Amino acid sequence: MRITSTANPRIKELARLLERKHRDSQRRFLIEGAREIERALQAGIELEQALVWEGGLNPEEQQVYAALLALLEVSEAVLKKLSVRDNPAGLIALARMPERTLEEYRPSPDALILVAVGLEKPGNLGAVLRSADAAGAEAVLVAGGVDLYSPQVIRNSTGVVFSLRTLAASESEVLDWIKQHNLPLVATTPHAEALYWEANLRPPVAIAVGPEHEGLRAAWLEAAQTQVRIPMQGQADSLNVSVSAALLLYEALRQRLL
Numbered sequence: 001m002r003i004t005s006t007a008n009p010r011i012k013e014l015a016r017l018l019e020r021k022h023r024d025s026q027r028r029f030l031i032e033g034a035r036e037i038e039r040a041l042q043a044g045i046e047l048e049q050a051l052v053w054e055g056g057l058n059p060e061e062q063q064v065y066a067a068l069l070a071l072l073e074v075s076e077a078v079l080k081k082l083s084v085r086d087n088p089a090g091l092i093a094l095a096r097m098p099e100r101t102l103e104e105y106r107p108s109p110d111a112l113i114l115v116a117v118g119l120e121k122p123g124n125l126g127a128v129l130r131s132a133d134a135a136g137a138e139a140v141l142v143a144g145g146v147d148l149y150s151p152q153v154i155r156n157s158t159g160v161v162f163s164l165r166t167l168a169a170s171e172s173e174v175l176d177w178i179k180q181h182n183l184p185l186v187a188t189t190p191h192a193e194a195l196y197w198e199a200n201l202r203p204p205v206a207i208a209v210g211p212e213h214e215g216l217r218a219a220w221l222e223a224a225q226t227q228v229r230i231p232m233q234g235q236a237d238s239l240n241v242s243v244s245a246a247l248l249l250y251e252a253l254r255q256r257l258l
Contacts, residue, residue: 002054004075011078014094018084020147027097029149030082033089034064039159041067046096053079053090061091084151097149105139105165107181110203112136112252114245115174117143117220118211126156127242129164133157135249139165141206143174175223178206187224188248189215190238196228201252209245212238
């Protein structure tokens with residue numbers, strides 16, 4: 001009926017989904033937020049149950065709730081237990097981990113690709129995917145492991161992870177892939193002479209960015225057709241990777257509209 005105790009066995013089972021091993025073995029994950037839940041539905045993700053704040057839902061959460069499966073009227077302390085936000089949504093769903101399709105990818109003639117190197121933080125991963133989605137990137141190639149169903153990747157990407165082609169592989173594997181398709185590569189580095197605005201970001205192209213507290217290894221710089229930098233005008237020595245990815249990708253979008 002109305003579950004208010006975090007000790008409730010049903011809630012103890014769902015809380016385990018906050019950890020990766022548990023999501024993978026059970027092929028299930030939580031989706032917090034009416035918009036995230038909706039985008040998941042729009043992507044074909046099957047839901048099994050939805051939890052609802054006993055104190056009511058906001059308008060948006062109400063229309064998502066309408067467009068729906070066992071339901072659970074739940075308390076704030078319980079949603080907070082399943083939440084990864086300061087203030088939890090009023091609607092959290094239990095989802096089935098999708099049928100991981102092993103389809104291969106080949107860049108189209110309009111391909112705008114973002115290559116993220118040294119990106120290990122799920123929060124950062126999500127923010128980066130959000131910037132790549134907004135700019136219109138065709139894919140995000142992550143050189144270094146990815147977890148598409150974690151709560152932080154889902155929140156920071158605002159659900160975009162359910163639709164943006166995001167792939168992982170070793171740096172060597174990704175680099176061999178680039179050359180395999182004769183895909184021009186533009187590497188970002190603070191010591192490059194050319195400003196990023198001067199590079200030619202014509203439709204078929206890949207843009208690499210490294211960690212914010214570090215540059216791209218020599219391997220990436222020797223493989224690039226062009227090396228470029230994002231000018232820093234003040235005290236800051238760097239920017240969050242999601243901000244850098246937006247800058248480079250929006251400049252690509254600006255050149256395309258020309």
